[PDB]
Design an enzyme around this catalytic site. Sequence first.
Site, PDB file in Angstrom:
ATOM      1  N   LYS C 164      27.565  89.161 -83.060  1.00 56.21           N
ATOM      2  CA  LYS C 164      26.917  90.620 -84.320  1.00 56.21           C
ATOM      3  C   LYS C 164      28.311  91.768 -82.694  1.00 56.21           C
ATOM      4  O   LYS C 164      27.675  91.839 -81.819  1.00 56.21           O
ATOM      5  CB  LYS C 164      25.480  90.580 -83.880  1.00 56.21           C
ATOM      6  N   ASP C 193      29.256  89.977 -87.580  1.00 56.97           N
ATOM      7  CA  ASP C 193      28.808  91.035 -88.415  1.00 56.97           C
ATOM      8  C   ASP C 193      27.855  91.923 -88.357  1.00 56.97           C
ATOM      9  O   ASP C 193      27.999  91.481 -86.856  1.00 56.97           O
ATOM     10  CB  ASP C 193      27.907  89.718 -88.640  1.00 56.97           C
ATOM     11  N   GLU C 219      31.641  90.667 -91.628  1.00 55.69           N
ATOM     12  CA  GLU C 219      30.314  90.623 -92.642  1.00 55.69           C
ATOM     13  C   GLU C 219      29.246  91.565 -92.519  1.00 55.69           C
ATOM     14  O   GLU C 219      29.259  92.771 -91.876  1.00 55.69           O
ATOM     15  CB  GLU C 219      29.268  88.879 -92.358  1.00 55.69           C
ATOM     16  N   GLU C 245      24.164  87.265 -97.982  1.00 61.26           N
ATOM     17  CA  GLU C 245      23.092  86.527 -97.071  1.00 61.26           C
ATOM     18  C   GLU C 245      21.823  86.925 -97.773  1.00 61.26           C
ATOM     19  O   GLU C 245      20.457  86.154 -97.920  1.00 61.26           O
ATOM     20  CB  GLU C 245      22.966  86.228 -95.391  1.00 61.26           C
ATOM     21  N   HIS C 295      23.562  80.210 -95.514  1.00 61.48           N
ATOM     22  CA  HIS C 295      23.184  80.578 -94.775  1.00 61.48           C
ATOM     23  C   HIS C 295      22.233  80.864 -94.556  1.00 61.48           C
ATOM     24  O   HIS C 295      21.489  80.566 -95.299  1.00 61.48           O
ATOM     25  CB  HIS C 295      22.966  82.520 -94.622  1.00 61.48           C
TER      26      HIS C 295
HETATM   27  C1  APG Z   1      22.704  87.822 -88.108  1.00 60.03           C
HETATM   28  C2  APG Z   1      22.568  87.686 -89.440  1.00 60.03           C
HETATM   29  O1  APG Z   1      22.545  88.081 -90.150  1.00 60.03           O
HETATM   30  C3  APG Z   1      23.113  85.757 -89.872  1.00 60.03           C
HETATM   31  O2  APG Z   1      24.227  86.009 -90.915  1.00 60.03           O
HETATM   32  O3  APG Z   1      23.508  85.168 -88.889  1.00 60.03           O
HETATM   33  C4  APG Z   1      20.649  86.752 -89.867  1.00 60.03           C
HETATM   34  C5  APG Z   1      20.276  87.096 -90.849  1.00 60.03           C
HETATM   35  C6  APG Z   1      18.162  87.284 -90.519  1.00 60.03           C
HETATM   36  C7  APG Z   1      18.326  86.074 -89.437  1.00 60.03           C
HETATM   37  C8  APG Z   1      18.900  85.469 -88.719  1.00 60.03           C
HETATM   38  C9  APG Z   1      20.342  86.410 -89.494  1.00 60.03           C
HETATM   39 MG    MG Z   2      24.957  87.584 -91.936  1.00 58.65          MG
END
Ligand code: APG
Ligand code: MG
EC number: 5.1.2.2
Lengths: 357, 357, 357, 357
Positions: C164, C193, C219, C245, C295
């Site tokens: 992230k 992300d 992302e 997601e 996801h």
């Molecule tokens: C960061 C995230 O968007 C991902 O894709 O990893 C994520 C979103 C929601 C809960 C956990 C992880």
């Molecule tokens: Mg994500």
Amino acid sequence: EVLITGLRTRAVNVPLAYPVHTAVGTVGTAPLVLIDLATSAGVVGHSYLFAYTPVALKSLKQLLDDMAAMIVNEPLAPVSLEAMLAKRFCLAGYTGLIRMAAAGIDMAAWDALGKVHETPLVKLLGANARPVQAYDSHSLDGVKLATERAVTAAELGFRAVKTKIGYPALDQDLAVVRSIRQAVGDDFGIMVDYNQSLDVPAAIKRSQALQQEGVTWIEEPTLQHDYEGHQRIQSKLNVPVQMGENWLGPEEMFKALSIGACRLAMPDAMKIGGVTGWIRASALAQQFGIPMSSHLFQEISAHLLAATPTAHWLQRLDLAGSVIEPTLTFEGGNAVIPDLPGVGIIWREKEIGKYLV
Amino acid sequence: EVLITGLRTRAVNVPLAYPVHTAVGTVGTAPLVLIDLATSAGVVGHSYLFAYTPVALKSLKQLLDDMAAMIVNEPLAPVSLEAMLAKRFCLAGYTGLIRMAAAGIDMAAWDALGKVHETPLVKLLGANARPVQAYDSHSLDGVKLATERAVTAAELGFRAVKTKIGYPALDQDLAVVRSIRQAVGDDFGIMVDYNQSLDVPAAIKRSQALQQEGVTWIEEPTLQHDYEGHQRIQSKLNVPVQMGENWLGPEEMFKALSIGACRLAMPDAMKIGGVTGWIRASALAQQFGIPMSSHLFQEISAHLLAATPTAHWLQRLDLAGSVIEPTLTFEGGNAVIPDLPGVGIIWREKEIGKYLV
Amino acid sequence: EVLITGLRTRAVNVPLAYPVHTAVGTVGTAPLVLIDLATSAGVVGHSYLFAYTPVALKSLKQLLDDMAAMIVNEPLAPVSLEAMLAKRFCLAGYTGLIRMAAAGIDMAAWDALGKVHETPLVKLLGANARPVQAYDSHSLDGVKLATERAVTAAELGFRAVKTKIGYPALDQDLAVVRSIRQAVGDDFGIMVDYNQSLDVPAAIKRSQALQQEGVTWIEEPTLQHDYEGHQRIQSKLNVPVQMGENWLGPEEMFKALSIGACRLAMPDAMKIGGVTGWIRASALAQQFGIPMSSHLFQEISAHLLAATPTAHWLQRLDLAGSVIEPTLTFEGGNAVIPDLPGVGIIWREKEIGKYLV
Amino acid sequence: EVLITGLRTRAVNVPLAYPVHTAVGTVGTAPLVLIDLATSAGVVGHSYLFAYTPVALKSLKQLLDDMAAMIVNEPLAPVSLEAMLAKRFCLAGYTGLIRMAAAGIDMAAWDALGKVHETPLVKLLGANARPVQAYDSHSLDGVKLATERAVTAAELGFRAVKTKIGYPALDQDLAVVRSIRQAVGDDFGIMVDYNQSLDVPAAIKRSQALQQEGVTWIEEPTLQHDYEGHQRIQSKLNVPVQMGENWLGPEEMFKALSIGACRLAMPDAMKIGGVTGWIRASALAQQFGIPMSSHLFQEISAHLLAATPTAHWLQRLDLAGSVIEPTLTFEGGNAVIPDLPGVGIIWREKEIGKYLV
Ligand SMILES: C[C@@](O)(C(=O)O)c1ccccc1
Ligand SMILES: [Mg+2]
Ligand SMILES: C[C@@](O)(C(=O)O)c1ccccc1
Ligand SMILES: C[C@@](O)(C(=O)O)c1ccccc1
Ligand SMILES: C[C@@](O)(C(=O)O)c1ccccc1
Ligand SMILES: [Mg+2]
Ligand SMILES: [Mg+2]
Ligand SMILES: [Mg+2]
């Protein structure tokens, strides 16, 4: 219950702290119309209008004096007021000077409404005051003065400046930008404004060269009304095209955004329709995913941006400083809304007398 | 300066004055969540939420009770508040129940803000109260009850009614409309609602037949999320397609309008995002040239429509009448905003106790 | 013949093996709702839901408890079941929490159907188990922890990790990516992300800089619901934009794909509508020429991807590991479907008791 | 060689031969600004401007008086002059009053140029005088006066009249049209003007009903700036939508035509930019396949239409008749260009004195 009881206007030509250099010459004054909106509640709303050129000054004022009649004895309901005026001027054309005039009234009405409620405008709008990042706005200054002005800005804590470019040769354009960069450092923001001075192909060529220099944005590269041309230029760039200062009403903004003419917007509180117009424009900007900055009217813009979902930058350019109290302050490059009912515009009457036209 | 100090919610199932007839059966109660937003200023803001089905009632309330923590001790700045919540719920999804919950808070915040300033909401919004034409909202009633209800409406001074259609056969649909028309006369408005019950081709077929009958609008002919399908249906009609009750936020409205899915809009104060969402939606409607009506929440909608540039109709459907004072009145088919600070929602505590869940 | 006989839910807050670091703080637990679907055949179907935030946990569970009534005594026919629920919730809005709830039921129904037939889900779906490449999913960790976590991943045999980003400054973003690259080597996949954190112009600027670093994908650069903005960003990049997601149902996916918002997709088994929704989404992805990743919900996703024509990556992120048996294994960076009827979800009852809410 | 040596303006309020009836009231005068452009050659060019409302009258005149300075001592080269002004007013906004002012100067410059060459304008333009069919322009008169006025028109030889409609009820609209038709006969042209008074859906509904009556065109059904709305209305009609009176410059015309907003055009010599603007507009009209009519300024329009490839109708509406010689005549419903240098505008000085403001 609260009525509009009178309108008084005064045309002035006030000295500018930062003389604006143009290709034409040096201009050290601004043609402004100061507005006082009286009410049945004892409060007086205040606003000002910028006339751009002294050629339009007296006409503007006279236009306001002549509209006074339609608004006196009407309730202090800015939204209702704007709709009435839109309908009164529908044949003549609700744009240009007429629209600017109506916007002056809107801004004063909203300042008065805040006074009646003893609350800062931003709060009446449903939001909290927040500090807004500002950029110091300069002109077509030459390499020496441009760099100078930029160094002072940084000294005063600003983190960005805007310079006017559009020299006969591209290389002059680049010389200005480079010297600023060299002096302020690599992070600092450098916004450039072409002031509608190029044709589409020239715009694409010069802009791609600037894009390699590292500019923050490219403002009004070509004729303002040419939305389609702005879109063409935008389409060949990574850097954002900025525009909006010349949109008269949110309906012009809507047209430009509909065709993807730009990636940034910067409406003018006056040209957009005052407080009422700004609120509409801010909803459009949010929906189209456009970061929204301001153009002129620093005092009211501080309030307006705090209530804007996509708020971006505040333009620091002090037009009316010589005739108003310094309630808006800059602390570490951010504008601070004064804690005062309305917009916090307070005349310096004694000075006004000096500049009267 | 003014802070949010607490949130209390009460889930109730209140009797409906006009039992809603459906294909399923007869429902005489409404699942509502009543909200009280406390402030540091001594004022208490009020709003209510509609849960649609009792299956969602307790979940809704619990969701609010759990959000209370994020809002307590925050300033009473509805615009700033909404942005905070939008950011807190960005992973979970700022839509559906969560969005409905946030909208309940917005509406209460705005009601409280009006109380702090001792002014009716409409006035705080910058507009004047005006009477708003309303239509009496009925259900899937059958020929007899439908005509009956329509005759009473006319008797009470309404100039339009809305009926639910979507019978197994088109001819039943037409029978209802004809009998109403025959009874109320040729001018009277007759709005019809399909409640998302048809597929595109069926929609086009039934609608063209209605169009010949003389209906005011055709509401939600197909699945609400199918903007493109609504556009297809619209494209084969002269009569307007109406939609909007199911848009969650102005961003859904923006999508639908962008593709020309309808000629009329009717956002729901709750689903659109409260006062904050409505103001945004009204700017969009103006720009796209769409007449804007309301869906449910008659009390607050009266205020909201008076500030809407393209205001069209107010939907009269009394959900909360059993637990609130009758401050909103109907005079000659127009809704009259009560002259009371905020929205003018006043609980009938003794009655609430009866319906508590 | 086979009927649904009961629904039991348990809300838990389970410890996370890999504490997720955010700009906000460190979160070491996950709010989950565990679902048990009883049947007339003696088999019990299992699924879990992720609540994102503890603010929504109790509301979610209560919503399920309240829906139990509509499903009990209905046949174990997941496809028929989903349509019934879509119709029951059409006024309230079949999205958000309600949709998530329905998806939990779908997933459990499908797990039970596999149990009745004594076959792994993938096989019931008409496909063969195959190993699926997985990437190890990390957080907003800082240069040190990010590199650390990435080195361990490689050690365990993964060939890609996701980090992230979205630091206050771009240069921080780049620092993270570079250090990982330096440590894992030039081939290794590095997915980034932004978690909806940037505006369109910022997105384009940061992304073009990353594109030069060599990232696998970018992302959710901007607000999830802004399909058009994602398209603008995509249009200025060679690297693929990844998203999906946050799509609630295949109908949201359809909208985004229709405008070319991305080059990659990654639906969430829960938000997409369970098994039933995934199968629909996979057909869309195939037709639009989009590689499809997963996801969350690693256990069921392994099965689902094996039946997906454009299967791309499986996201390794163990939410429920503390309360379930470790039947899904990772061998050389690929996920291995366990040879067990249904999804192969087996509770660790003793542990559940510990985390109960 | 030929220079501009001075500018004199006089504001007057002249009586109207045909009192214009509006929803508001009865207006029997017109606010006009009369312009005299002096030259080094001894010739004096003449034009007039229409102010629409007396609220704008003095402002207009003052604006001209203030621009005098920029034009004095400039060559009498209307094309070069217009470009200079476009550049001087580019920040303020070259539209609205400013644009109207510039157009007044253009028209006078062209009248003077014709005087210097001792030739009628039409001939200087490269064309021959031809008679142009004209329609007699009336107002929102009621059934009685409307029919009356129409019968007189026919008596005087006109083959078409235009009436203003937009009554509270459609049926009033239809009553007016029917009575005219009944009185003038089946061939006669009946043009109707809504004056921007309806919303899109209302426009479509009323217009389809008129279309069945047999009207010549439907003029400005909705807000003038809403090109997209005009397109929607147009798309549901066989009868032509007419528009153009409110276009400020050919650049506004270009926008509207680009989206197919109408099937007919009718620029206003003043709002379009004078002679210079008209010539540009006529090229656009030809290319887009649009029949082009005129709006106001009957004297100069006669000349302009004779040089227009797609010339359609001339609008007979005598604004300045009380202060000018009657050189333009109507013979059998066609306008006849007088054989006089320039436009053939000759003041009745003695009368002017009477109306001076
Ligand atoms: C960061 C995230 O968007 C991902 O894709 O990893 C994520 C979103 C929601 C809960 C956990 C992880
Ligand atoms: Mg994500
Ligand atoms: C150059 C300018 O376009 C700006 O944005 O700074 C500007 C326009 C008008 C008046 C002052 C400044
Ligand atoms: C039928 C309806 O769609 C309407 O608009 O009246 C409606 C929807 C939801 C609750 C009550 C009424
Ligand atoms: C009604 C009108 O739009 C027309 O075309 O006749 C008109 C507009 C402005 C002044 C006079 C007449
Ligand atoms: Mg600029
Ligand atoms: Mg409905
Ligand atoms: Mg007209």
